[PDB]
């Protein structure tokens, strides 16, 4: 019976490792806090160095982004998200995230992503897909590669 | 200011038309009740004749299915959903819906779909995508084709 | 590890019992399909005889109501929900549901309720609260009272 | 037609004011980023000075808390949330938030609260309720009190 085990949890910053966004990039780091397989939701911190244009992605659900530090923007919009701002991406929209400056502080963002991230080509083809399964595979692959007993980010406990 | 206009609404069965799932099928009918563009959620009735195997789809979010009448199942699972049952599909999973019998009552289902439906080939390629945008395009295209003043399924009012 | 057990499930109409909405009413019946303790969501069928005014309730989240049969309405609104209609109640609103006629078919409704139902007095005081915990208590109390092995409505499997 | 206006938005830290959590406290500050009246969801930054025990509250939905700075905890749990941690509160649970130390850095937290916050007495009575309506009233009352043209936190645009 699952409800007997469900309760308010807390995962401290240094109880989940920072890890490279493999096999695509070694500079973009990610830290997984929650990976909900029922609704397909992930809660993460995402570190990225300055002056980096990232791939255009089509996202199926919503994305809440709180900028911890640094500045960034989408090539498709005329605004810049600074530290202390909140960006709310809506369903079935396309975005090309990138750094707001060629050099400066690294971009750290707290993200709550619902649904899958479908990465695209210039010719508009779907090349890669990131979801809770790919998030979990990466989290468990890094843990098993190192000597880290992995935590259950799937449950709410 | 949007909250001033937000309130509990009601769309009666004969205030939204039954329409073919164009341009793919003329036999599978759909009725749109809500098309949320923020979270990418649609509420619909979906009519389908007996003995029809539908395309395999990968779904990015959740799907709550209440069977109004008829019986159906997924080729990937060993159970059959009858009238009065509730099926709860979870994020990033693949399913091939089909009729539970070659002949009998038409399958009517009340569906609450969160996210996009990525239709696939036997070779596993993404061929078609259904989302709130494609749902809205179809709803507005049928209304404009006929003499129907379309309703705002985007707002909650 | 929870994600290893998460999958698309199906609960048939006669695999969850119809039960009175105890200890408040013996005429209003409820059937529980899902009782999510993480987000506080319940999926149910709710049967009610004609000509019955129910208590006014304040609801904290949303409610999607599909009318399977019968007709009903809220005293606070000028519309009537008939069979085949969809009603979408929005957050922090107050409603007094009641039958659209003094005599006629029993009202059966498919409901997806997110959050708690705070029942109120004429003097506007909170008297009763219905949530996933009270839903689960009732489901498990009826099952234990009878000889029914209860199902895990808490998990998505 | 609402979907025509829906798009990815961004509210910068200094485009929404820090304001006291009136009429209850002048020391606890709040900053509103989003106030969704459909699902009853609010996105906020919440500043609180060290060594402050806050009222016990029962919450109807979920709460995602990212600690920007400082340390805090719930009296009902044995863990402490530090800067860089993520706390996920689940539906229909009771918590007494408080500072992890009598003196030290002020507690700043990024919160995503779904549903209402029902504040309680020692005798367990519901005394106060905070929701999107009370959040909006406070946001609009402070703006009108000062010479601030208020932003539409209700829409996703």
Coordinates of C-alpha atoms in Angstrom, one line a residue:
Chain A
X1 CA 0.0 0.0 0.0
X2 CA 1.9 3.2 -1.3
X3 CA 0.1 5.9 0.8
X4 CA 1.5 4.4 4.0
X5 CA 5.1 5.2 2.8
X6 CA 4.2 8.8 1.2
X7 CA 5.4 11.8 3.2
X8 CA 7.3 15.2 3.0
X9 CA 10.9 14.6 2.0
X10 CA 14.0 16.6 1.6
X11 CA 17.1 16.1 -0.6
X12 CA 20.1 18.3 0.4
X13 CA 22.3 19.8 -2.3
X14 CA 25.3 17.5 -1.5
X15 CA 23.1 14.2 -1.3
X16 CA 22.6 14.1 -5.1
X17 CA 25.7 14.5 -7.3
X18 CA 26.4 17.2 -10.0
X19 CA 26.9 15.2 -13.2
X20 CA 27.7 16.0 -16.8
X21 CA 24.8 15.9 -19.3
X22 CA 26.2 12.8 -21.0
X23 CA 26.5 11.6 -23.8
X24 CA 25.8 15.1 -25.3
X25 CA 27.9 17.5 -23.2
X26 CA 30.7 17.5 -20.6
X27 CA 30.4 21.3 -19.8
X28 CA 26.6 21.4 -19.1
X29 CA 26.1 19.9 -15.6
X30 CA 22.8 18.6 -14.1
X31 CA 21.8 17.7 -10.5
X32 CA 18.6 15.5 -10.1
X33 CA 16.3 16.1 -7.1
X34 CA 13.1 14.4 -8.2
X35 CA 12.2 12.2 -11.3
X36 CA 8.4 11.5 -11.2
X37 CA 7.6 8.6 -13.6
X38 CA 3.8 8.9 -13.2
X39 CA 3.3 12.5 -14.5
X40 CA 6.8 12.7 -16.2
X41 CA 8.2 15.5 -14.1
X42 CA 11.8 16.3 -13.1
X43 CA 13.2 18.9 -10.6
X44 CA 16.8 19.8 -11.3
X45 CA 19.6 22.4 -10.9
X46 CA 21.3 22.9 -14.3
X47 CA 24.8 24.6 -14.5
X48 CA 26.1 25.9 -17.8
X49 CA 29.2 28.0 -18.6
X50 CA 28.9 31.5 -20.2
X51 CA 28.8 32.0 -24.0
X52 CA 27.1 28.7 -24.9
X53 CA 24.2 28.4 -27.4
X54 CA 22.3 25.2 -26.7
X55 CA 20.1 23.1 -29.0
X56 CA 16.6 24.2 -30.0
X57 CA 14.0 22.0 -28.2
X58 CA 10.3 21.5 -28.5
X59 CA 8.8 20.9 -25.1
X60 CA 5.5 18.9 -24.6
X61 CA 4.5 20.3 -21.1
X62 CA 5.5 23.2 -18.9
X63 CA 8.8 24.4 -17.5
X64 CA 9.2 26.7 -14.5
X65 CA 12.7 28.2 -14.4
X66 CA 14.1 30.1 -11.4
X67 CA 17.6 31.6 -12.2
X68 CA 19.9 31.1 -9.2
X69 CA 22.8 33.0 -10.9
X70 CA 23.9 34.2 -14.3
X71 CA 21.9 35.6 -17.2
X72 CA 20.3 33.8 -20.2
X73 CA 17.6 34.1 -22.8
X74 CA 15.8 32.4 -25.7
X75 CA 16.7 33.4 -29.3
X76 CA 12.9 33.5 -30.1
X77 CA 12.1 36.1 -27.3
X78 CA 13.2 39.8 -26.7
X79 CA 13.8 39.5 -22.9
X80 CA 16.7 38.3 -20.7
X81 CA 16.2 36.2 -17.5
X82 CA 18.6 37.5 -14.7
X83 CA 19.3 36.0 -11.3
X84 CA 16.2 36.2 -9.1
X85 CA 13.8 36.0 -12.1
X86 CA 11.2 33.4 -12.9
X87 CA 10.5 32.1 -16.5
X88 CA 7.3 30.0 -17.2
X89 CA 7.5 28.1 -20.5
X90 CA 4.0 26.9 -21.8
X91 CA 3.1 23.6 -23.6
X92 CA 4.1 22.6 -27.2
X93 CA 6.5 25.6 -27.8
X94 CA 10.0 25.8 -29.3
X95 CA 13.0 27.5 -27.7
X96 CA 16.8 27.9 -28.2
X97 CA 18.3 28.7 -24.8
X98 CA 21.6 30.6 -24.7
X99 CA 23.8 32.7 -22.5
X100 CA 23.0 36.4 -22.3
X101 CA 26.8 37.2 -22.6
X102 CA 29.9 35.7 -24.2
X103 CA 31.8 35.8 -20.9
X104 CA 30.8 36.2 -17.2
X105 CA 29.3 34.1 -14.4
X106 CA 28.1 30.5 -15.0
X107 CA 24.4 30.1 -15.5
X108 CA 22.8 28.1 -12.6
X109 CA 19.0 27.5 -12.9
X110 CA 16.4 25.6 -10.8
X111 CA 14.1 23.9 -13.2
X112 CA 10.7 22.1 -12.8
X113 CA 10.1 20.4 -16.2
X114 CA 6.8 18.5 -16.9
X115 CA 6.9 16.3 -20.0
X116 CA 9.5 15.5 -22.6
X117 CA 12.1 17.7 -24.3
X118 CA 12.3 16.9 -28.0
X119 CA 15.6 18.3 -29.4
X120 CA 15.5 19.5 -33.1
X121 CA 17.7 20.1 -36.2
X122 CA 17.8 23.2 -38.3
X123 CA 15.8 21.2 -40.8
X124 CA 13.2 20.8 -37.9
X125 CA 13.8 17.0 -37.4
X126 CA 13.4 15.4 -33.9
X127 CA 17.0 14.2 -33.1
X128 CA 17.0 13.6 -29.3
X129 CA 14.4 13.2 -26.6
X130 CA 14.9 13.8 -22.8
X131 CA 12.4 12.6 -20.4
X132 CA 12.1 11.0 -16.9
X133 CA 13.4 7.7 -18.3
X134 CA 16.6 9.3 -19.9
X135 CA 17.0 11.4 -16.6
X136 CA 16.8 8.2 -14.5
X137 CA 19.1 6.3 -16.8
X138 CA 21.7 9.0 -16.5
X139 CA 21.3 9.4 -12.7
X140 CA 21.6 5.6 -12.2
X141 CA 24.4 5.2 -14.8
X142 CA 26.6 7.8 -13.0
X143 CA 25.9 6.3 -9.6
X144 CA 26.7 2.8 -10.8
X145 CA 29.9 4.1 -12.6
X146 CA 31.1 5.6 -9.3
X147 CA 30.5 4.0 -5.8
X148 CA 27.3 6.0 -5.0
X149 CA 24.3 4.1 -3.6
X150 CA 21.6 5.8 -5.6
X151 CA 18.5 7.4 -3.9
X152 CA 14.9 6.7 -5.0
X153 CA 14.0 10.0 -6.8
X154 CA 10.9 8.1 -8.2
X155 CA 9.0 8.1 -4.8
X156 CA 7.7 11.0 -2.7
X157 CA 9.0 10.0 0.7
Chain B
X1 CA -6.6 40.9 -15.7
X2 CA -7.5 37.2 -16.4
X3 CA -8.6 36.1 -12.8
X4 CA -11.6 38.5 -13.0
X5 CA -13.0 36.4 -16.0
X6 CA -12.1 32.9 -14.5
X7 CA -15.0 30.8 -13.2
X8 CA -16.7 27.4 -13.2
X9 CA -18.0 26.6 -16.7
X10 CA -20.1 23.9 -18.4
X11 CA -20.1 22.8 -22.0
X12 CA -23.1 20.6 -22.9
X13 CA -22.8 17.6 -25.1
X14 CA -24.6 19.3 -28.1
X15 CA -22.7 22.7 -27.7
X16 CA -19.5 21.3 -29.2
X17 CA -19.7 19.2 -32.5
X18 CA -18.7 15.6 -33.1
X19 CA -16.1 15.7 -35.8
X20 CA -13.9 13.3 -37.8
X21 CA -10.3 12.9 -36.7
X22 CA -9.1 14.6 -40.0
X23 CA -7.0 14.3 -42.0
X24 CA -6.1 10.7 -40.7
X25 CA -9.5 9.1 -40.3
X26 CA -13.2 9.7 -41.2
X27 CA -14.5 6.8 -38.9
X28 CA -12.8 7.9 -35.6
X29 CA -14.9 10.8 -34.3
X30 CA -13.8 13.3 -31.6
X31 CA -15.6 15.9 -29.5
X32 CA -13.6 18.7 -27.9
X33 CA -14.6 20.0 -24.4
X34 CA -11.4 21.8 -23.3
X35 CA -8.1 22.6 -25.0
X36 CA -5.7 24.1 -22.4
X37 CA -2.7 25.7 -24.1
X38 CA -0.8 26.5 -20.9
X39 CA -0.3 22.9 -19.6
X40 CA -1.2 21.2 -22.9
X41 CA -4.3 19.4 -21.7
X42 CA -7.4 18.3 -23.7
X43 CA -10.7 16.9 -22.4
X44 CA -12.6 14.9 -25.1
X45 CA -15.1 12.2 -26.0
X46 CA -13.7 9.8 -28.7
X47 CA -16.0 7.5 -30.7
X48 CA -14.5 4.6 -32.7
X49 CA -16.2 1.7 -34.5
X50 CA -15.6 -1.9 -33.5
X51 CA -12.8 -4.0 -34.9
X52 CA -10.3 -1.2 -35.5
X53 CA -6.6 -1.4 -34.6
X54 CA -5.3 2.2 -34.2
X55 CA -1.7 3.5 -34.6
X56 CA 0.9 3.0 -31.9
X57 CA 1.6 6.2 -30.0
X58 CA 4.2 7.3 -27.5
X59 CA 2.6 9.8 -25.0
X60 CA 4.6 12.4 -23.1
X61 CA 2.3 13.0 -20.1
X62 CA -0.7 11.2 -18.5
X63 CA -4.0 10.0 -19.9
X64 CA -7.1 9.3 -17.8
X65 CA -9.6 7.2 -19.8
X66 CA -13.2 6.5 -18.6
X67 CA -15.0 4.1 -21.0
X68 CA -18.6 5.3 -21.6
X69 CA -19.4 2.3 -23.8
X70 CA -17.8 -0.6 -25.7
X71 CA -14.7 -2.5 -24.9
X72 CA -11.0 -2.0 -25.9
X73 CA -7.5 -2.8 -24.9
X74 CA -3.8 -2.1 -25.6
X75 CA -1.8 -4.8 -27.5
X76 CA 1.0 -4.3 -25.0
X77 CA -1.2 -5.3 -21.9
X78 CA -3.2 -8.4 -20.9
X79 CA -6.4 -6.6 -19.6
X80 CA -9.5 -5.3 -21.3
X81 CA -11.2 -2.0 -20.4
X82 CA -15.0 -2.4 -20.4
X83 CA -17.8 0.3 -20.0
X84 CA -17.6 1.8 -16.5
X85 CA -13.8 1.2 -16.2
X86 CA -11.0 3.7 -15.7
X87 CA -7.6 3.4 -17.4
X88 CA -4.7 5.6 -16.2
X89 CA -1.8 5.8 -18.7
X90 CA 1.5 7.1 -17.2
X91 CA 4.2 9.3 -18.8
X92 CA 6.6 8.3 -21.6
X93 CA 5.0 5.0 -22.4
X94 CA 4.0 3.4 -25.7
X95 CA 0.5 1.9 -26.6
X96 CA -1.4 0.4 -29.5
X97 CA -5.1 0.9 -28.7
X98 CA -7.6 -1.4 -30.4
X99 CA -11.1 -2.8 -30.1
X100 CA -11.6 -5.8 -27.8
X101 CA -13.9 -7.5 -30.5
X102 CA -14.1 -7.6 -34.3
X103 CA -17.8 -6.6 -34.2
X104 CA -20.1 -5.1 -31.5
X105 CA -21.0 -1.7 -29.9
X106 CA -18.9 1.3 -30.9
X107 CA -16.3 2.4 -28.4
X108 CA -17.0 5.8 -26.8
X109 CA -14.4 7.0 -24.3
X110 CA -14.0 10.1 -22.1
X111 CA -10.4 11.1 -22.2
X112 CA -8.2 13.7 -20.2
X113 CA -4.9 13.8 -22.0
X114 CA -2.0 15.8 -20.6
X115 CA 0.9 16.4 -23.1
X116 CA 1.4 15.3 -26.7
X117 CA 0.7 12.0 -28.6
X118 CA 3.7 11.1 -30.8
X119 CA 2.4 8.5 -33.4
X120 CA 5.0 5.9 -34.5
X121 CA 6.0 3.5 -37.4
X122 CA 6.8 -0.2 -37.1
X123 CA 10.4 1.0 -37.6
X124 CA 9.8 3.2 -34.4
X125 CA 10.0 6.6 -36.3
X126 CA 7.8 9.6 -35.1
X127 CA 5.3 10.2 -38.0
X128 CA 2.6 12.4 -36.5
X129 CA 2.1 14.5 -33.4
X130 CA -1.2 15.4 -31.8
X131 CA -1.3 18.2 -29.2
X132 CA -3.4 21.1 -28.1
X133 CA -2.4 23.1 -31.2
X134 CA -3.4 20.3 -33.6
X135 CA -6.6 19.8 -31.5
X136 CA -7.4 23.6 -31.7
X137 CA -6.6 23.7 -35.5
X138 CA -9.0 20.8 -36.1
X139 CA -11.7 22.3 -33.9
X140 CA -11.4 25.8 -35.5
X141 CA -11.1 24.3 -39.1
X142 CA -14.3 22.3 -38.8
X143 CA -16.2 25.3 -37.2
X144 CA -15.0 27.6 -40.0
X145 CA -15.7 25.0 -42.7
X146 CA -19.4 24.8 -41.4
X147 CA -21.4 27.9 -40.1
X148 CA -20.5 27.3 -36.4
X149 CA -19.4 30.2 -34.2
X150 CA -16.5 28.5 -32.3
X151 CA -16.4 28.5 -28.5
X152 CA -13.3 29.5 -26.5
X153 CA -12.1 26.1 -25.2
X154 CA -8.7 27.8 -24.3
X155 CA -10.1 29.7 -21.3
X156 CA -11.7 28.4 -18.0
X157 CA -14.8 30.5 -17.8
Chain C
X1 CA 12.9 1.9 -6.5
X2 CA 9.2 3.0 -7.4
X3 CA 9.6 3.7 -11.2
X4 CA 10.4 -0.1 -11.8
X5 CA 6.8 -0.8 -10.6
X6 CA 5.0 2.2 -12.3
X7 CA 2.9 1.3 -15.4
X8 CA -0.5 1.8 -17.2
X9 CA -3.2 0.2 -15.0
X10 CA -6.9 -0.5 -15.4
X11 CA -9.6 -0.9 -12.7
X12 CA -12.8 -2.4 -14.1
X13 CA -16.2 -1.1 -12.8
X14 CA -17.0 -4.3 -10.8
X15 CA -13.4 -4.5 -9.2
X16 CA -14.0 -1.6 -6.8
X17 CA -17.3 -1.5 -4.8
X18 CA -20.1 1.0 -4.9
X19 CA -20.4 2.3 -1.3
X20 CA -22.4 4.8 0.7
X21 CA -20.8 8.1 1.5
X22 CA -20.6 7.3 5.2
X23 CA -21.1 8.6 7.9
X24 CA -22.9 11.5 6.2
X25 CA -25.3 9.8 3.7
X26 CA -26.6 6.4 2.9
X27 CA -28.3 7.5 -0.4
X28 CA -25.3 9.1 -2.1
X29 CA -23.1 6.3 -3.3
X30 CA -19.4 6.6 -4.4
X31 CA -17.0 4.2 -6.2
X32 CA -13.2 4.9 -5.8
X33 CA -10.9 4.3 -8.9
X34 CA -7.8 6.2 -7.8
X35 CA -6.7 8.0 -4.6
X36 CA -3.4 9.8 -5.2
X37 CA -1.8 10.8 -1.9
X38 CA 1.1 12.8 -3.4
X39 CA -1.0 15.4 -5.3
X40 CA -4.2 14.8 -3.4
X41 CA -6.3 13.6 -6.4
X42 CA -9.2 11.2 -6.5
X43 CA -11.0 9.7 -9.5
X44 CA -14.6 8.5 -8.7
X45 CA -18.1 7.7 -10.0
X46 CA -20.7 9.3 -7.7
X47 CA -24.4 8.2 -7.8
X48 CA -27.1 10.4 -6.2
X49 CA -30.9 10.1 -6.3
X50 CA -33.1 12.8 -7.9
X51 CA -34.4 15.8 -6.0
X52 CA -31.5 16.0 -3.5
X53 CA -29.8 19.3 -2.5
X54 CA -26.3 18.6 -1.2
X55 CA -24.1 20.6 1.2
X56 CA -22.3 23.7 0.0
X57 CA -18.6 23.1 -0.3
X58 CA -15.5 25.2 -0.9
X59 CA -13.0 23.3 -3.0
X60 CA -9.2 24.0 -2.9
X61 CA -8.1 22.7 -6.4
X62 CA -10.0 21.8 -9.6
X63 CA -12.8 19.4 -10.4
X64 CA -13.5 17.9 -13.8
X65 CA -17.1 16.4 -13.9
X66 CA -18.4 14.3 -16.8
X67 CA -22.1 13.5 -16.3
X68 CA -22.8 9.8 -17.2
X69 CA -26.5 10.2 -16.6
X70 CA -29.1 12.5 -15.1
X71 CA -29.1 16.3 -14.8
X72 CA -27.8 18.6 -12.0
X73 CA -26.6 22.1 -11.4
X74 CA -25.1 24.5 -8.9
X75 CA -27.4 27.0 -7.1
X76 CA -24.7 29.7 -7.7
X77 CA -24.8 29.3 -11.6
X78 CA -27.6 29.7 -14.3
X79 CA -26.7 26.5 -16.3
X80 CA -27.7 22.8 -16.0
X81 CA -25.2 19.9 -16.7
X82 CA -26.9 17.1 -18.7
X83 CA -25.7 13.6 -19.5
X84 CA -22.8 14.0 -22.0
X85 CA -21.7 17.4 -20.6
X86 CA -18.4 18.4 -19.0
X87 CA -18.2 20.8 -16.0
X88 CA -14.8 22.3 -15.0
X89 CA -14.8 23.8 -11.5
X90 CA -11.7 26.1 -10.8
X91 CA -9.7 26.6 -7.5
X92 CA -11.0 28.3 -4.3
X93 CA -14.7 28.5 -5.4
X94 CA -17.9 27.7 -3.5
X95 CA -20.7 25.5 -4.9
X96 CA -24.0 23.9 -3.8
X97 CA -24.7 21.0 -6.1
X98 CA -28.2 19.8 -6.5
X99 CA -30.5 17.8 -8.8
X100 CA -32.0 19.6 -11.8
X101 CA -35.4 18.0 -11.1
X102 CA -37.4 16.8 -8.1
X103 CA -38.0 13.4 -9.7
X104 CA -36.3 11.5 -12.6
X105 CA -33.2 9.4 -13.4
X106 CA -30.5 9.1 -10.7
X107 CA -27.5 11.4 -11.2
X108 CA -24.3 9.4 -12.0
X109 CA -21.1 11.5 -12.5
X110 CA -17.4 10.7 -13.3
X111 CA -15.3 13.1 -11.2
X112 CA -11.6 14.0 -11.1
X113 CA -11.1 16.0 -7.9
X114 CA -7.7 17.6 -7.1
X115 CA -7.4 18.9 -3.5
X116 CA -9.8 19.0 -0.6
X117 CA -13.6 19.6 -0.3
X118 CA -14.3 21.9 2.7
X119 CA -18.0 21.6 3.5
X120 CA -19.7 24.7 4.9
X121 CA -22.6 25.9 7.2
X122 CA -25.1 28.7 6.3
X123 CA -23.1 30.8 8.8
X124 CA -20.1 30.0 6.4
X125 CA -18.2 27.8 9.0
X126 CA -16.0 24.8 7.9
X127 CA -17.8 21.7 9.3
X128 CA -16.4 18.8 7.3
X129 CA -13.4 18.1 5.1
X130 CA -13.1 15.4 2.4
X131 CA -9.7 14.6 1.0
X132 CA -7.6 11.6 -0.2
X133 CA -7.2 10.5 3.5
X134 CA -10.9 10.5 4.2
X135 CA -11.5 8.8 0.8
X136 CA -8.9 6.1 1.6
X137 CA -10.3 5.6 5.2
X138 CA -13.8 5.1 3.8
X139 CA -12.5 2.7 1.0
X140 CA -10.4 0.7 3.5
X141 CA -13.2 0.7 6.2
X142 CA -15.9 -0.7 3.8
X143 CA -13.5 -3.3 2.5
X144 CA -12.5 -4.4 6.1
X145 CA -16.1 -4.3 7.2
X146 CA -17.0 -6.8 4.3
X147 CA -14.7 -9.6 3.1
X148 CA -13.0 -7.6 0.3
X149 CA -9.3 -7.7 -0.2
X150 CA -8.7 -4.0 -0.9
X151 CA -6.7 -2.8 -4.0
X152 CA -3.9 -0.3 -3.9
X153 CA -5.6 2.8 -5.3
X154 CA -2.5 4.9 -4.0
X155 CA -0.1 3.5 -6.7
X156 CA -0.1 3.9 -10.5
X157 CA 0.5 0.3 -11.6
Chain D
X1 CA -9.7 33.5 -27.8
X2 CA -7.1 32.9 -25.0
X3 CA -4.6 30.6 -26.7
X4 CA -3.8 33.4 -29.2
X5 CA -2.4 35.4 -26.2
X6 CA -0.6 32.5 -24.3
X7 CA 3.2 32.4 -24.6
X8 CA 6.4 31.9 -22.6
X9 CA 6.8 34.9 -20.2
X10 CA 9.5 36.1 -17.8
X11 CA 9.1 38.3 -14.7
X12 CA 12.4 39.7 -13.5
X13 CA 13.2 39.9 -9.7
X14 CA 12.8 43.8 -9.6
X15 CA 9.5 43.9 -11.7
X16 CA 7.4 42.5 -8.8
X17 CA 7.8 44.1 -5.4
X18 CA 9.0 42.5 -2.1
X19 CA 6.1 43.1 0.3
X20 CA 5.2 42.3 3.9
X21 CA 2.9 39.3 4.5
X22 CA 0.1 41.6 5.7
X23 CA -2.0 41.8 7.9
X24 CA -0.2 38.9 9.9
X25 CA 3.5 39.8 9.8
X26 CA 5.7 42.8 8.9
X27 CA 9.0 40.7 9.1
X28 CA 8.0 37.9 6.8
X29 CA 8.3 39.3 3.2
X30 CA 6.8 37.7 0.0
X31 CA 7.4 38.4 -3.7
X32 CA 4.7 37.2 -6.2
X33 CA 5.7 35.8 -9.6
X34 CA 2.6 33.8 -10.7
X35 CA -0.9 33.5 -9.2
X36 CA -2.8 30.9 -11.2
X37 CA -6.6 31.1 -10.4
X38 CA -7.6 28.1 -12.5
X39 CA -5.5 25.4 -10.6
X40 CA -4.9 27.5 -7.5
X41 CA -1.1 27.7 -7.9
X42 CA 1.3 30.5 -6.7
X43 CA 5.1 30.9 -7.5
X44 CA 6.9 33.1 -4.9
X45 CA 10.1 34.0 -3.1
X46 CA 9.6 34.2 0.7
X47 CA 12.1 36.0 3.0
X48 CA 12.0 35.4 6.7
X49 CA 14.5 36.5 9.5
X50 CA 16.4 33.9 11.6
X51 CA 14.9 32.5 14.8
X52 CA 11.3 32.7 13.9
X53 CA 8.7 29.9 14.5
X54 CA 5.8 30.3 12.1
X55 CA 2.2 29.0 12.4
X56 CA 1.3 25.4 11.8
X57 CA -0.5 25.0 8.6
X58 CA -2.4 22.2 6.9
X59 CA -1.9 22.3 3.1
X60 CA -4.4 20.9 0.6
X61 CA -2.1 20.3 -2.5
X62 CA 1.7 20.1 -3.0
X63 CA 4.6 22.5 -2.2
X64 CA 8.0 22.4 -3.9
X65 CA 10.5 24.5 -1.9
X66 CA 14.0 25.4 -3.2
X67 CA 16.1 27.1 -0.4
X68 CA 18.0 30.0 -1.9
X69 CA 19.7 30.8 1.4
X70 CA 19.6 30.1 5.1
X71 CA 18.4 27.0 6.9
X72 CA 15.0 25.9 8.1
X73 CA 13.0 22.8 9.1
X74 CA 9.6 21.5 10.1
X75 CA 9.0 20.7 13.8
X76 CA 7.3 17.4 12.7
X77 CA 10.4 16.1 10.8
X78 CA 14.0 15.2 11.8
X79 CA 15.9 16.9 8.8
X80 CA 17.1 20.4 8.1
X81 CA 16.7 22.1 4.6
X82 CA 19.9 24.0 3.8
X83 CA 20.7 26.4 0.9
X84 CA 20.7 24.4 -2.4
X85 CA 18.2 21.7 -1.1
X86 CA 14.8 20.8 -2.4
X87 CA 11.8 20.0 -0.1
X88 CA 8.7 18.4 -1.6
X89 CA 5.6 18.6 0.7
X90 CA 2.7 16.2 -0.3
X91 CA -1.1 16.7 -0.1
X92 CA -3.2 17.0 3.1
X93 CA -0.2 17.2 5.6
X94 CA 0.5 19.4 8.6
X95 CA 3.7 21.4 9.1
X96 CA 5.2 24.0 11.5
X97 CA 8.0 25.7 9.6
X98 CA 10.8 27.3 11.6
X99 CA 14.3 28.6 11.4
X100 CA 17.1 26.0 12.0
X101 CA 19.0 28.5 14.2
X102 CA 18.2 31.4 16.6
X103 CA 20.5 33.8 14.8
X104 CA 22.2 33.8 11.3
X105 CA 21.4 34.5 7.6
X106 CA 17.8 35.3 6.7
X107 CA 15.8 32.4 5.1
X108 CA 15.0 33.0 1.4
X109 CA 13.0 30.2 -0.3
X110 CA 11.6 29.7 -3.8
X111 CA 8.2 28.1 -3.4
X112 CA 5.7 26.6 -5.8
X113 CA 2.5 26.1 -3.8
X114 CA -0.5 24.2 -5.3
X115 CA -3.8 24.6 -3.3
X116 CA -4.6 26.4 -0.1
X117 CA -2.7 26.9 3.2
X118 CA -5.1 26.4 6.1
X119 CA -3.5 27.9 9.3
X120 CA -4.3 26.1 12.6
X121 CA -4.5 26.7 16.4
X122 CA -3.0 24.5 19.1
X123 CA -6.6 23.3 19.6
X124 CA -6.4 22.3 15.9
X125 CA -9.0 24.9 14.7
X126 CA -8.7 26.5 11.2
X127 CA -8.0 30.2 11.9
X128 CA -6.7 31.6 8.5
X129 CA -6.6 30.5 4.9
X130 CA -4.1 31.6 2.2
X131 CA -4.9 30.9 -1.4
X132 CA -4.5 32.5 -4.8
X133 CA -7.4 35.0 -4.0
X134 CA -5.7 36.2 -0.7
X135 CA -2.3 36.3 -2.7
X136 CA -3.9 38.4 -5.4
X137 CA -5.7 40.7 -2.9
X138 CA -2.4 41.3 -1.1
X139 CA -0.5 41.9 -4.4
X140 CA -3.2 44.3 -5.8
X141 CA -3.7 46.0 -2.3
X142 CA 0.1 46.8 -2.0
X143 CA 0.3 48.0 -5.7
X144 CA -2.8 50.3 -5.3
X145 CA -1.4 51.6 -1.9
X146 CA 1.8 52.6 -3.6
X147 CA 2.0 54.0 -7.2
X148 CA 2.7 50.6 -8.9
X149 CA 0.8 49.6 -12.0
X150 CA 0.2 46.0 -11.2
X151 CA 1.1 43.2 -13.6
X152 CA -1.2 40.3 -14.7
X153 CA 0.2 37.4 -12.7
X154 CA -3.1 35.5 -13.5
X155 CA -2.3 34.9 -17.2
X156 CA 0.6 32.9 -18.8
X157 CA 1.9 35.4 -21.3

